[PDB]
Amino acid sequence: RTKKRICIIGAGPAGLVMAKSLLEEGHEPVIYETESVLGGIWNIKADKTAGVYNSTRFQNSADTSFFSDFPADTTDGFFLGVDQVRAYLQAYASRFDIHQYIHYNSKIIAVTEHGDQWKVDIGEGDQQQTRYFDGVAMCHGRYKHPFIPTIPGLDQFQGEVLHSGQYYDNRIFAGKRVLVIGNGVSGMDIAEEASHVASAVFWSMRSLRLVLPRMVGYLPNDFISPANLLISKDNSIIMERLKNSMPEYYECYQKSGLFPSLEDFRANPFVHINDGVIQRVAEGAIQTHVEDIERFTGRGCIFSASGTHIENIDMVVLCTGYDNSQSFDYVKQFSMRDDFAMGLFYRQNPSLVNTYGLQNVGTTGTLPYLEMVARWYAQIISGNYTLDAEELNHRAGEGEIVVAPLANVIMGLKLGLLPDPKTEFQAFWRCLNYPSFPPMYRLRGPHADPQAQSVLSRSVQRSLIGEHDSQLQTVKHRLLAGLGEEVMQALLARQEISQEEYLQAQRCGENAIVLSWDTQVIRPVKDRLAEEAFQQRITELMSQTLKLDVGQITADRHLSDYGFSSVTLTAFSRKITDEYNIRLQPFVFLEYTTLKALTDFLYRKWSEQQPA
Ligand SMILES: Cc1cc2nc3c(=O)[nH]c(=O)nc-3n(C[C@H](O)[C@H](O)[C@H](O)COP(=O)(O)OP(=O)(O)OC[C@H]3O[C@@H](n4cnc5c(N)ncnc54)[C@H](O)[C@@H]3O)c2cc1C
Ligand SMILES: NC(=O)c1ccc[n+]([C@@H]2O[C@H](COP(=O)([O-])OP(=O)(O)OC[C@H]3O[C@@H](n4cnc5c(N)ncnc54)[C@H](OP(=O)(O)O)[C@@H]3O)[C@@H](O)[C@H]2O)c1
C-alpha cells in the first residue's frame, strides 16, 4: 500500500535513474514517455529537429560520466559516442528491470497540485486520461526547443537556413558556401566538420570562449579533483595544465586568434570541449568573424564592426542553442526560477522535483549529477530527509555554472555517502583529491554496492599518472579550520590529525573554507571619434596578445621592443582580421615599425573597404 506512486515524465537518462532510485526505496515508478523508445536525446529521428548528431561523443571520460553502480563499457573508447551511450541506457534499464514501468507513446499534458496529491493529464486526444500521484519527477531534459535569434533580414534570406538540432552529418555541406553562427559546442563541431566538405566555411561569433580538447595531456580534461577546484583560481590550474602539458595546442590556440581575454573568461568561465576546430581555424580552413551580424541580404550577410559583406551564402546553420523555457509548459502555472529551492525541489511541495535543475553542469558528466538528485529525492519521498530552511532558501540564478565534482561532494555529504569530515577527516580528504569517480559514492550510506570499491580502484589507478601540494595543504588547513574549534580539538584528541595540521588550521582561521551549497556555483561577471576608437581597440588587442598593460604600449615606441613572438605576433594579427576584416600581408611589420605607423596603415586599408 504505502508504495508511493510517482509520475516520472521522460524515459531519458534522468527518468531511468529516477525510477531505479525510487525502486530502491520501495516506491512505485510510473514513467510516461512521448516517444516510442527509451534513451532521450540520444535517439535519432529522420525528420530530425532535436537530438544528438552523428559524431557526438561524450565530452568527459567514462570514469566520471556514468552511474555509481553501473560502469560503462569502454572497449571502443573512453569517450563514448551515440551508439554506446544508448546501449548503456538500455543495459541499465535491463539490469534494474525498469522497462515494465515505462509507458511509451504517452505525453504528459498538465500537472496541477491537488491537495498533497498531484493530478496529471496524460496523452493527447481520444487517449486523454487523468491519473493521480504522490509525487512528480520532471525528467524531460533540455535541448529540444530550438532558439532562433531575431536578426534583421534573416526571414527574407533566400538560402537554406538550419538550426543545429536538425544536424546529423556534414554531407549536407558538400559544395556549399556555409555560414555557421554561434560558438557553443554545436557551432564548434558543425563549423569544424563543415570545413572538411564545404566550398567555404564562415564562422560568426560575438565573444570568445575557453576551449579544451577531450584529452589534456595524457589525462582526460575531467580528471581534476575538488581540492584543486578549491584552490579556485578557476581554471588557472587547468590553463596551467594545458600550458605545461599541451604546449603545441596552446601555441596553436593562440595563433588562431581565438584564445579569449581575461574579461572574456570571467564573463563565461565555462570550459567547452572540442577536438579540432582550433586547428582548422589556425590552418585557414575556417574564416572566423568575431563580431555582430548587422543584417542579412537576400543571399549574403553584413557585419556591424567590420562592414564585411559575405556574398552568395548557400546555408546558414543557426547554432544558437535552445529555449528550454517551453520544456516546462505542462507546469506553466509555476515559476521554476522562483519556486524551486536550488532549482531542484518545489519549495512548498518537494514531491515535485526538477531533476536537471536550472544551471549549467560543467567539469564532469551530467549523468551522475542527475543520479545524485535522484538518490536525494528518493529519500525525501521515504520521509528519511526533510529539507531544512537553508536548503529551501536557495535560488538557482540565471547564468550560473555548477562545478559538478563539488556538487557531488556537497550532496554526497548530505546523504552520508562520504567519510565524515568531523570524524574521518583524513578519508574525507582523500576523497576531495580524487577526480569525480561515481563509484566513490556507493561505498557507504543508502544503498551501497560491494563491487564499488574494485571499480573505484581502476579509476583511481588511472588518476595517479601538477601538485602545488603547498596550496593543497593550505586547502586542507583551511577546510579543517572551517570545521570549528570543538571538532578540531576532537580530531586532534582522537588522533585523526597531526599536531602540525591542527596548529596551522588554528592560524588559517579568517580564511576558513566552509563547504555549503554555493561551494558548487560559479557566477559569470558581465570620423575623428571613430579613428580614436580604432587605435584604442588595436592597442587592447596588442595588450591582450602580449600580456602587457596599455600603459606600457605607446604610439611611437618601436613594436620590436615589446618582445613579440612568432606565436604572439600571429595571434595579434589574426585578432585584427577577426574584428575588422583586414588582412596583414607578410611584410606589414617590416614596413610599419611603430604602433602609430601600424594603426594608421590599417585604418586606411579598413576604410578603402567599407568601414563602420
Ligand atoms: C549534442 C549534445 C551533446 C551532448 N553531450 C553530452 C556529454 O558529452 N555529456 C553529458 O553528460 N551530456 C551531454 N548532453 C546532454 C545530456 O547528456 C542529456 O541531457 C542527457 O541525456 C540527460 O537527459 P535527460 O535524462 O535530462 O532527458 P533527455 O535525454 O533530454 O530526454 C528527456 C525525455 O523526456 C521525454 N519527454 C519530454 N517531455 C515529455 C512529456 N511532456 N511527456 C512525456 N515525456 C516527455 C522526451 O521524449 C525525452 O525522451 C548532450 C546533449 C546534446 C544535445
Ligand atoms: N557536460 C556536457 O558534456 C554537456 C552537457 C549538456 C550539453 N552539452 C553541450 O551543450 C550543447 C547544446 O548547446 P549549444 O552549444 O548548441 O548552444 P549554446 O551553448 O547555448 O550556445 C549557443 C551559441 O549561439 C550563439 N548565439 C546565441 N544567440 C546569438 C545571436 N543572436 N547572434 C549570434 N550568436 C548567438 C552563442 O554565442 P554568444 O556567446 O554570443 O551568445 C552561443 O555560442 C550540446 O552541443 C552539448 O555538446 C554538454
Automatic annotation (TrEMBL):
Record-annotated Carrier domain positions: 532-606
Location of the protein in the cell: Cytoplasm
Binding locations of NADP(+): N183, G184, V185, S186, R206, R209
Binding of FAD, residues: A14, E33, T34, I41, W42, Q59, I108, K144, T366
Function: Involved in production of the polyketide antibiotic thailandamide.
Similarity comment text for this entry: Belongs to the short-chain dehydrogenases/reductases (SDR) family.
Protein name per UniProt: Polyketide synthase modules-related protein
Species: Gynuella sunshinyii YC6258
Native organism taxonomy: Bacteria, Pseudomonadati, Pseudomonadota, Gammaproteobacteria, Oceanospirillales
